[PDB]
Amino acid sequence: AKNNAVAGFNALNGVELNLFTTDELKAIHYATMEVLMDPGIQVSDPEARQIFKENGCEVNEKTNVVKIPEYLVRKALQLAPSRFVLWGRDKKFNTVQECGGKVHWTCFGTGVKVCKYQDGKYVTVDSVEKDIADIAKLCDWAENIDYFSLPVSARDIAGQGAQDVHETLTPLANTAKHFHHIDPVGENVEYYRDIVKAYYGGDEEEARKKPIFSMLLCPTSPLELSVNACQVIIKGARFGIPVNVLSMAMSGGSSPVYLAGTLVTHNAEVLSGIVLAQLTVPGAKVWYGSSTTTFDLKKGTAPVGSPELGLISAAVAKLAQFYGLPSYVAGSKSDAKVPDDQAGHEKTMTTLLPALAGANTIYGAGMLELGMTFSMEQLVIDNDIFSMVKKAMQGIPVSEETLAVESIQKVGIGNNFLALKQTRQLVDYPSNPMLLDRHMFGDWAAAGSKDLATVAHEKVEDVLKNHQVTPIDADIFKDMQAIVDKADKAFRGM
Amino acid sequence: AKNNAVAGFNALNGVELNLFTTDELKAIHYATMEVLMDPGIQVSDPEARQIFKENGCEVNEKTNVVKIPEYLVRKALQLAPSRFVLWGRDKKFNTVQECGGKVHWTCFGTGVKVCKYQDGKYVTVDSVEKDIADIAKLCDWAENIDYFSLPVSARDIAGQGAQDVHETLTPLANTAKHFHHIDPVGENVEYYRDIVKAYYGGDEEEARKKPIFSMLLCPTSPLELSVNACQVIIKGARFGIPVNVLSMAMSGGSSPVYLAGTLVTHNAEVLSGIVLAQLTVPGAKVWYGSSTTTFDLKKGTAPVGSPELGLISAAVAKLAQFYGLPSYVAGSKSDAKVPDDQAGHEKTMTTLLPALAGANTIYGAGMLELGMTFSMEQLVIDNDIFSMVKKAMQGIPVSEETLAVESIQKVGIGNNFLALKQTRQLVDYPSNPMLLDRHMFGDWAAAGSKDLATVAHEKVEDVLKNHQVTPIDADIFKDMQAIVDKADKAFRG
Amino acid sequence: AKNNAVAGFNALNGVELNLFTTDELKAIHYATMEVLMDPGIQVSDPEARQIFKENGCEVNEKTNVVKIPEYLVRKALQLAPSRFVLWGRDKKFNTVQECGGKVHWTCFGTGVKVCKYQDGKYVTVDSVEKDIADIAKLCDWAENIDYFSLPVSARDIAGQGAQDVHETLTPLANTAKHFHHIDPVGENVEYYRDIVKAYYGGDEEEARKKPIFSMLLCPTSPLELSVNACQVIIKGARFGIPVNVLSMAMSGGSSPVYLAGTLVTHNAEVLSGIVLAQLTVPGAKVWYGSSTTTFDLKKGTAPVGSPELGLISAAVAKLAQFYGLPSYVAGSKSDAKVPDDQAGHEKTMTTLLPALAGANTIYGAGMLELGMTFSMEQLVIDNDIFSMVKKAMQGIPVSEETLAVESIQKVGIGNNFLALKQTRQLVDYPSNPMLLDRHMFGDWAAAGSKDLATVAHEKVEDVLKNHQVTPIDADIFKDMQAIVDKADKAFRGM
Amino acid sequence: AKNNAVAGFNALNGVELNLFTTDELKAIHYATMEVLMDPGIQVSDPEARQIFKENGCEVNEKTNVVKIPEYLVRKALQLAPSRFVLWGRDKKFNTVQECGGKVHWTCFGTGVKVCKYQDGKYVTVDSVEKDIADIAKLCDWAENIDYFSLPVSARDIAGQGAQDVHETLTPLANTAKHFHHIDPVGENVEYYRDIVKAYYGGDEEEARKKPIFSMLLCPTSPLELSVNACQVIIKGARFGIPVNVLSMAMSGGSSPVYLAGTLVTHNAEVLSGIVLAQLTVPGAKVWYGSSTTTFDLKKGTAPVGSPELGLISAAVAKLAQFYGLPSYVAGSKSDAKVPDDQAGHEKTMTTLLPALAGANTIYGAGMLELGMTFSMEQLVIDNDIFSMVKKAMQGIPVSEETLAVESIQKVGIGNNFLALKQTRQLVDYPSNPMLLDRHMFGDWAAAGSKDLATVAHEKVEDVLKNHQVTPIDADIFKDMQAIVDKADKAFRGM
Ligand code: NA
Ligand code: NA
Ligand code: NA
Ligand code: NA
């Protein structure tokens, strides 16, 4: 009968996107190891500078300049786990972060304005702790949004209390998907530790095992570690909070105009963060990350929706895969000041590259205005664009079955597979976009001839008006909120 | 001193995107052959059937089903030139089509409706012959549209005259660039040949030694070769005109719901058309094309701005590089009825994949509404998109200079490169979009707060109102004009 | 949430076995190419010598020695179909023979003796057409036997008529699988053509489009094309019958002691056949075959159960894949004069190697005594072996599901997977040997303490007295049976 | 003239068997570093448990559940040697165990029954310390048996004396080949260390330098480390006694039905044991071993003669080579009760797969009845198979001399090589089995139509009587024999 015995067969599952060779990967490494020694990094916080020294570095106390020897970069890289798991309040939302090409998406972070609908026209308005609750609710419904990252700032809590300890409980409550705090504060890290230890009722061990709060720090480009960042890392490590050491460098700005040199300036900064982490607590969960892009040597902005942002995040991932770490990179971002043709493009352009390259986590969903405004319409739109990607990422499955030769034959010359059994079993196999319109001119017209913004906007309302977000336990919540009030109290007592 | 010597070094220039492995490529191939022997392929054209029979196929004269032996696919593929040049009336538009990754873009083709303006809004009219004379004018200006493919059908010529011969002189007339005729007629291929022999002054050599015109054809899925097709090929071969054998299958409709299967069906049809071409005139200029997409088993239509399409065009571009022929795949399309947020995503998703796979020619620029409308506005957007795509395909160039180690050092800790000499030199290195906005909310708002559609629209006007298209010779034009006239004459006959 | 998106992942399905680098392959080819020009092969038949001569072959008529130019070796290898399919009378037995590693099995062909059981022990007596009938029925049951190949000879028809023609109708009659004739006779090739054509109701189109018969010739080692072999090709190619150009060299005998060298001699012999096949009729179905083995300079016999046999088939298989042709090779062959311990080892040693190598068709199933005797018992035992192989060929399927991390987890430390949901969905996943006894000592002895030999013998009997075979149509059989007679009478007429 | 200058050339020496890609290794790895953290590994022994905690391991003191951080796996591995040597009392038996594909064989261990010749038939009688004596004498002779591994138990010592110590000196005196103790005891490791120090005469460095004693232990599936096992690792590690950290999972019982998943469990277990040994003593010679098999939920037992076992070992050998350590896998085992066809087959299946993948040590020779009985006949047989296995691993040597185009010509069309020089010189080159019969039928019948089993029985007999085992210096044996006494004496003091 038909064969069912085959010899070794080499296959390709999904889509492979190559940006470097080892000889090239290594060069980028060497150049960074050089830069790490001259000039080195400016580590402002003294405690961190202390840890660096103890472990073998060369710290210049008058200029706060540390020189990291490759052997530490090496050692650091051996301590770090190649994988850890982000937890949610609903285990179903858990998300894994592991050295590989297993792609996950998260929303933008962190904007200051919100693109809400006013009198017929969408209006850019200043964000507030409440806007955060709405986004959080929305992203709790968006499937492709694995976990939540602080979308906008609680500006209205500015000089009022612990805005940062605020941007913690709000998210944890308006969603059950893991929370990634983009704006942490080195001195208030204990507050996050507490708020979580609170969720798991006074039990710390549990909050270390099932962490629901992770944070992001930023090496100040070029070649500097802010005191805020040093404490975020150190506290992040010791307590058990995953730490994303993401970078924001700009070709022609804080790093070379060339993409390659830029990567170096980035690698150096991010690697010094990761090093500082493992020297504090070996096995500290870390993220080799980046949001680096290029400086528009003209317009006067940080274009975050251009191929460069895409290529770099793409590359950053490949570098993370090379170092054995999980990647969190900029992706699905746009410089469009509105959800129009451009927006859709730049979003698709900056996400597909990093995804095919295997970015363990791409952030930018729902963002607009080069990271200034956050649009909920743009989000659900992006959240759909990802589904398309996840299909494309399916690439081409070549098997005797998928080849379907008999199938081709049964149908014969000049017929259709419509009736056929197989065709019916694969009704869902094809990509079925939630918001994209695949209708005739009639169907569409006889439905309002609405553009995607509108189609999406109508979706924004619906979700908000009915999505069901698993709420935090009655008492537990008041325990957590306790730490927030204590944080505001502490704060006002200048 | 500084080093200036290096041993063996393996580099990666560009962005390498992979879909298959050899073992898998072979697999696809066998299915394609295993199918080429059963059921086979229906060849309605009796002259074709003879050509096939003449070489060793099993031409069942009563059903027309030809059966092609792998060895004939082997000789076919060893005859078809791996590369051939396209010529625009303007030498500076020449476009090399060669088995490999050298990618090029060409506008969409060929719809029946145009998305133009009216009263503050865009409206869907029905294509005409004055439209083609404009689409051609724009594409002549569009710097990422290497050559011209028929945009929309000159409807005001149906039953009036030879719509095709009209659809030939009009384009060639309104664009120095090359012309790829989407809907040519097998019985009039000689008309075209002559319209060209004219431009060159009755010199059928300069007409061969400089194809300023090429054509397309689509085997009828699944596994059929329409009569018009076989003649477009046979004549195209005989006259020495570049023929593009593009498939039109639809997973879940005319081909297996699966892609691998769909590729087999596509491979089957496209190849046969290639074998038929070669057996006609060894060395005939052919293409391994495809517009194959998936039938939306949930909307009762053919989504062509979907990731499904993207993957198919990209896969075809590989099967193309595999056998050894130039590719022409369906990319940069969208099922969006309006140049909105969707247009971007869809256009980008579908153009990217083939662009990165190495499609030798990607077409669909300007399209909209699954392929019924041609927005002059989207065309320009897509053209600015292609530009961005290009910077992308440059990936990361890792060299001792691009790594800029010394640069990082002269600037050092906490400073900028704005000053740096090297940086002042690379001012035109970073991607610079023509339409895409990258300003602040302020700057942009004080512009009118124009969305890309509106902005892309004002660009069209500017182009149509001021683009100087290199005009055909005065007489030369009147000569060709006649070929169209005589053609229309015979028509009314 | 749970990951459902991954990029470029290279995987290995099944088990891969390598024998050569492309350089060694090419090298072997180069020897072969030169050996064809010097000394060249001896084409005993004039018709073929002519055919060769016409396409540009230096043909010395005084010695019949033909020299083949590389470009012809090339032309032919490009003319031979990469794939063709064997047809059984039951479309549910059809077997695909196509370049690659799609492994298939067939019984041995063809011994002169039959090893049966008489007075308690095993008795090796001479075969008779009846035996052929019994083997045919037996194999029509065995799953792993894709198709049937003339197992033994009708030594009783010897002298009474044309045995080879009887050797055609009997097999085609006792089994509805495909029939591969190991002993065709060049002059009678037409008799086969008709029995088949007869079967199809005279329609030759159907006989050519659905070959129910195929045959194998043999280059005469070292470097000779016997007329018998020449006619089989020329006539096979013309009629439309799959021809198997299989070599039978012997290291230390008709080829060097080394194996690399024996492969050259073989390669030279086999290709010369294909050159003929294609030059006769372009596109003729062909098989790159071998059963070459090493000679045991010590024992004076050419062992066909030695590792060298296995090594050689494996190599030939690869050589076929190199030239783009389907392969037919030895394997699953033993030298032991009875189904004992030796038997099982040699069977495996020679079937395992060629199999993991991708041989398109392994033949030798149910054979004993250096290819002299056919063992009804060893055929079922072997058949089951082919199963344990098909399983082994699955190797390790590594996917998110196979890794089944959750599975290991839900079960947890110090527990059993016994009553776990997934375990019960894979109840039939493991290898389930039909003969090989996998019972405790107890359960076995309480079943007669039967060794594999006897246990087999019993399932042999059951299969014969109980297996049904799709009979050929009454009307048709007499038509074919008539072709047999028109040949027997004509044989006697001398 | 004749060339003797050739540019770069890629060659494949032997046969290569693949199973995973790197992406797939990384995959299997992560799942092990995922499991190694959750659930974790239960360490029964507190002394070892302390060692884990000491080195940053999170111990759940109450449940005894140790969570091993990936970095401890990485560090453990960096410490472990990539090679070490096994010594025999006879310098000529020294066996190297090194990361790579250098294959070696050792007898099965450790059954409790000896298949011996009763009244004309084979009987399964319970073993005794004496059995070990002879089995040791047998193996000593078997050239394809690198070193000896306690095959049967000194059953007649249970509840009478220090059995395991009897299972030490006994093997050691009845063979000069290295002895691997399959079942050592955590509280007697010191007796062994002393006994060895005795052979060398006080010099412990000699005992460290030339270990003539190694020992194995088995983690408890799934995810457990019995008290005894832990002590084995620790003591062996501290004394400089190699230690085989061999796992014994069962697909469908203690590990996922799938093999990928099972391997993951195998990995977690076998690694933890490696991590322990290392943390206890950096540089402790160890083994990444396994005998994990499948479990026919049907037959009611775990068959160690199935293709599953075959694949598993192979898979484990690769993993072993992946991590840089030596392998000790199960192979050359059978489920058959009597040495019949099944034996010879199942043995070649389980032994060939690992030999090819390149197991650094394969063990299962001389075994039958799913690991219950130890056949002395099957032993001499398996050993002779390994010879055929060894030839097979020679694959095809492609070279100017091996291709031998001159030789092919020197002989020419239709003439043999038997008379040729190159042939008479290579008379020893082909595989020459000791028991596999390659005689024609006639010669065989004369020999008395003896199967392989009995011809094997006659060989065992011939060996047990006449093979001489090197005498341990009489005096030294006294010293050694003495320490075994102190082992018994002490034993009765409880
Ligand atoms: Na694939
Ligand atoms: Na590059
Ligand atoms: Na696999
Ligand atoms: Na070799």
Author numbering:
A (entry chain D), C (entry chain A), D (entry chain F): 2 to 495
B (entry chain C): 2 to 494
Describing publication, verbatim:
The 22nd genetically encoded amino acid, pyrrolysine, plays a unique role in the key step in the growth of methanogens on mono-, di-, and tri-methylamines by activating the methyl group of these substrates for transfer to a corrinoid cofactor. In summary, we have determined the structures of native MttB, and its complexes with a substrate analog, sulfite, and its physiological relevant corrinoid protein, MttC.
In our first structure of a pyrrolysine-containing protein, the monomethylamine methyltransferase MtmB, we demonstrated that addition of dithionite to MtmB crystals resulted in addition of a sulfite group to the pyrrolysine imine carbon. It should be noted that the water that hydrogen bonds the pyrroline imine nitrogen in the native MttB structure is absent in both the sulfite-bond MttB and the MttB-MttC complex. This may suggest that during turnover, addition of TMA to pyrrolysine may precede MttC binding—since nucleophilic addition to pyrrolysine would be slower without a hydrogen bond donor.
